[PDB]
Amino acid sequence: DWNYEHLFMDIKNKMAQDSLPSSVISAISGQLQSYSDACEVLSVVEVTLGFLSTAGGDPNMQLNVYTQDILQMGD
């Protein structure tokens, strides 16, 4: 039942958002020839969405740097 919409509105209020460039879309589309890998990536995106919605962050910060350094979300 998670109301993702509220999280999205909170984030947009806290930070800026932009659409994916076609290049990134094609790259991820090519790389993600597997449902499992998609789910893994989406789980990382969901955790990031939660943290950003609460705290926030630099819209230009790379997502991998944010997850690995700040969230320590390795492993």
Partner 1 sequence: SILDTTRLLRSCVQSAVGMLRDQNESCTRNMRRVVLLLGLLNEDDACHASFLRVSKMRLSVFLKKQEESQFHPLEWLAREACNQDALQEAGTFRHTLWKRVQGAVTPLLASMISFIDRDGNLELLTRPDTPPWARDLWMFIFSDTMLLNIPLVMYIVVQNHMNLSENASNNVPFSWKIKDYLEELWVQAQYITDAEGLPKKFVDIFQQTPLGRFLAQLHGEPQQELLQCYLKDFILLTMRVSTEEE
Partner 2 sequence: NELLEPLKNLAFSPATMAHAFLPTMPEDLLAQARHWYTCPNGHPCSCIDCHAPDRTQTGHVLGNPQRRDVVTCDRGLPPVVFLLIRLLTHLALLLGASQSSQALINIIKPPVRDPKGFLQQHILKDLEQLAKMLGHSADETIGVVHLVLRRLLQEQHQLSSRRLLNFDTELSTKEMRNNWEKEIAA
Partner whose footprint covers residue 5, from partner 2, partner 1, none (CB < 5 to 8 Å by kind): partner 2
Residues 5-44 that bind partner 1 (CB under 8 A): 34-36, 39
Interface pick for partner 2 out of 9, 20, 27, 63 (rule CB under 8 A): 9
**How many chain residues interact with partner 1 (CB under 8 A)?**
15
Binding status of residue 5 toward partner 2 by CB under 8 A: yes
Two structure tokens written together for 59? 């819209």
Residue 61 interacts with partner 2 (CB under 8 A): yes or no: no
Burial class of residue 11 in the structure, from the number of CB atoms within 10 Å of its CB (0-12 exposed, 13-18 middle, 19+ buried): buried
Q: Does the footprint of partner 1 cover residue 47 (CB under 8 A)?
A: yes
H or E element, residue 36: helix 35-54
Q: Name, in order, each residue with C-beta under 8 angstroms of 71's C-beta and a sequence gap of 6 or more.
A: 47, 48, 51
